[PDB]
Amino acid sequence: PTEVHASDLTLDRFIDADTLATAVNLPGPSPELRTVLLTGATGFLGRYLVLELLRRLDVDGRLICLVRAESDEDARRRLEKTFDSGDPELLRHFKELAADRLEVVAGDKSEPDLGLDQPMWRRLAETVDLIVDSAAMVNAFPYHELFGPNVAGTAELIRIALTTKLKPFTYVSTADVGAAIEPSAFTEDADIRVISPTRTVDGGWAGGYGTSKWAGEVLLREANDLCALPVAVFRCGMILADTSYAGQLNMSDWVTRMVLSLMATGIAPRSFYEPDSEGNRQRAHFDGLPVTFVAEAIAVLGARVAGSSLAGFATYHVMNPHDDGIGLDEYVDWLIEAGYPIRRIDDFAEWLQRFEASLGALPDRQRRHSVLPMLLLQPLKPCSAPTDRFRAAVRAAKVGSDKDNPDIPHVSAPTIINYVTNLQLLGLL
């Protein structure tokens, strides 16, 4: 348990003085993105970013993916394996997109030079036109990279972005960055260093993800101060599996574990939320977005280089802002109405203690995939995080399905039922 100040996350603590001094005078980057470096390709959002970035590259484009592995071919197999989820069309689509344009290299972004050979590192510094940093897949508790190695990895990527030629930098962040912040200060335009100058590291497994992402944003703000490096920060809410391909889930995230838990225990509460002022089921909204939308938004908006501002730093709140009354209770409604073996326990006190107990009664393999590890708690109190810049950009860049009146989508029943479908495909239900 220790305290970190944004002011101590200066680039000179990770990058040599010569590189930093030279970056000041480098010109703005070329808007033409032919070589893209992607981290986190084996993670859930990363996989969809692989597809979206390959679709956006030309026949001469190249996508270079850094993957933790024993060797470059081990890395290639690990990444290819994540697209082998029981959907023949996904594998077919991936292979055709990747052919002659996907390069997978073994490395650890938290290590010096990304754990890469110096010839490879130098080719990256000389040829990469765009850096995309997404969340790598961590299947063990607490399901994310610890603060130290994560900060080290962002700094290493910034080193590449600052060497030889400046490189636009897309950074996947999280709504959780705003947890320690009054909502009226937590805007897309605010400088993270001003509104969130101090944070506790190791302050509970829940807050570890937000604090590690906070540190990356601070380092990118420092890079942007130094040389106007074009940066695009995407603070994402919960990213949902969707119906585009079968078998594609983030097994580590809370929603996947909760759907498994509800189905395996068979018991749901009357409401996950405090009753409203009349004692009724409270109007609530869950901030989730389908991964296909999120990946497409990040790709389209992260490619704004010629149209980046003069100062060059953009933050987008990739969040579902709707006051639509679609929250966790409606997700449970949909599962029950689909005919799944879930019953509600009307007394909430009865539910939470029977639910935690029922999880401990599951077979070992299910227990590990449930919310029980995260348990080992009260009704939830239910639009505060502004999305003005993201939502306006969704309309202008025509992100998503509807190219006529584009807007941020809502969550609908097929997405929720599809979690059960995928979990059954995996043999976990």
Side-chain angles (χ1 to χ4, degrees):
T2 201
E3 306 295 323
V4 177
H5 299 306
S7 57
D8 293 328
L9 291 170
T10 51
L11 296 189
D12 53 18
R13 314 208 323 131
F14 312 84
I15 305 171
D16 58 284
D18 292 315
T19 294
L20 298 179
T22 299
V24 173
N25 304 307
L26 286 174
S30 164
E32 174 201 85
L33 314 179
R34 323 189 140 86
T35 305
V36 176
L37 177 62
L38 173 63
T39 62
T42 65
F44 178 60
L45 170 67
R47 272 163 248 167
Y48 284 80
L49 283 165
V50 166
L51 297 174
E52 182 71 28
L53 297 165
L54 284 174
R55 288 190 296 251
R56 293 173 55 84
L57 287 164
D58 213 330
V59 296
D60 63 338
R62 169 166 305 195
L63 177 66
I64 302 176
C65 295
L66 184 83
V67 173
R68 292 214 56 257
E70 304 170 337
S71 71
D72 289 347
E73 179 64 22
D74 187 53
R76 197 196 58 79
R77 296 180 216 231
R78 288 177 172 264
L79 182 56
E80 184 159 44
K81 181 63 62 40
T82 70
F83 294 91
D84 183 29
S85 58
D87 191 309
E89 174 51 33
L90 171 60
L91 205 60
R92 184 219 83 83
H93 189 43
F94 167 75
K95 291 170 159 296
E96 294 183 356
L97 282 177
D100 306 313
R101 301 187 302 156
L102 176 66
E103 172 173 13
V104 191
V105 296
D108 188 341
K109 60 178 304 201
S110 76
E111 306 279 42
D113 291 345
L114 306 183
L116 296 171
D117 300 343
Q118 261 275 326
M120 180 71 200
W121 192 93
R122 280 279 150 178
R123 168 161 64 95
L124 295 184
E126 287 169 13
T127 64
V128 165
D129 304 318
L130 167 67
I131 293 165
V132 180
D133 178 14
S134 66
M137 185 50 54
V138 174
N139 322 278
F141 190 92
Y143 317 115
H144 73 84
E145 209 177 15
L146 304 175
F147 183 84
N150 189 95
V151 176
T154 304
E156 290 294 333
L157 287 179
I158 289 172
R159 194 147 63 82
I160 290 178
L162 291 187
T163 299
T164 303
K165 61 196 197 85
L166 299 179
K167 309 181 177 56
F169 195 123
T170 286
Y171 183 75
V172 176
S173 191
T174 176
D176 298 350
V177 170
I181 299 171
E182 55 286 29
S184 78
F186 185 55
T187 75
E188 287 157 310
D189 286 322
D191 188 324
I192 189 59
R193 298 170 299 180
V194 179
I195 61 174
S196 189
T198 304
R199 274 183 107 96
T200 303
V201 179
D202 306 279
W205 87 271
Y209 184 52
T211 293
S212 75
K213 288 303 97 188
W214 165 86
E217 292 192 27
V218 171
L219 290 171
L220 291 161
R221 270 294 182 175
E222 291 292 320
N224 178 261
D225 279 5
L226 176 79
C227 60
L229 179 72
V231 179
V233 170
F234 297 93
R235 300 198 183 122
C236 301
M238 177 72 57
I239 304 173
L240 302 180
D242 63 30
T243 53
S244 288
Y245 312 106
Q248 285 298 320
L249 297 181
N250 183 348
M251 297 306 301
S252 59
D253 78 26
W254 184 84
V255 175
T256 305
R257 292 175 170 269
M258 266 304 314
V259 173
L260 182 152
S261 304
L262 293 174
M263 288 289 301
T265 67
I267 53 169
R270 174 204 283 190
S271 180
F272 293 98
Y273 306 87
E274 296 181 343
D276 71 17
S277 54
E278 301 286 335
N280 291 323
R281 198 168 99 179
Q282 183 161 11
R283 185 178 180 86
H285 169 79
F286 183 84
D287 172 15
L289 291 170
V291 62
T292 293
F293 173 82
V294 175
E296 179 184 342
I298 288 168
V300 173
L301 295 178
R304 295 182 152 184
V305 181
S308 67
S309 70
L310 277 190
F313 199 104
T315 301
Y316 302 95
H317 284 177
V318 182
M319 297 164 196
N320 179 344
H322 300 296
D323 174 21
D324 52 18
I326 299 169
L328 295 164
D329 291 338
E330 283 70 34
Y331 299 168
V332 169
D333 292 345
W334 294 339
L335 296 169
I336 291 172
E337 291 154 7
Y340 287 127
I342 296 173
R343 62 172 65 78
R344 280 185 152 115
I345 300 178
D346 190 68
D347 169 9
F348 184 89
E350 276 292 279
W351 171 76
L352 177 58
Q353 70 94 82
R354 292 178 56 188
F355 178 75
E356 173 164 4
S358 191
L359 294 172
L362 299 174
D364 189 82
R365 185 151 58 106
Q366 258 174 3
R367 285 201 310 269
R368 286 168 180 287
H369 285 110
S370 79
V371 294
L372 190 52
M374 302 174 160
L375 274 66
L376 312 180
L377 295 184
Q378 298 302 309
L380 294 174
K381 310 178 236 64
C383 179
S384 294
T387 49
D388 305 84
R389 304 192 73 86
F390 181 58
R391 201 169 180 177
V394 169
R395 182 209 300 191
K398 295 177 176 302
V399 178
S401 305
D402 204 322
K403 311 296 192 181
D404 301 284
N405 40 310
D407 198 3
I408 301 172
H410 309 247
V411 176
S412 60
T415 298
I416 300 302
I417 274 68
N418 189 51
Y419 275 84
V420 180
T421 302
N422 283 343
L423 288 168
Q424 293 173 321
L425 284 193
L426 274 53
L428 296 161
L429 290 181

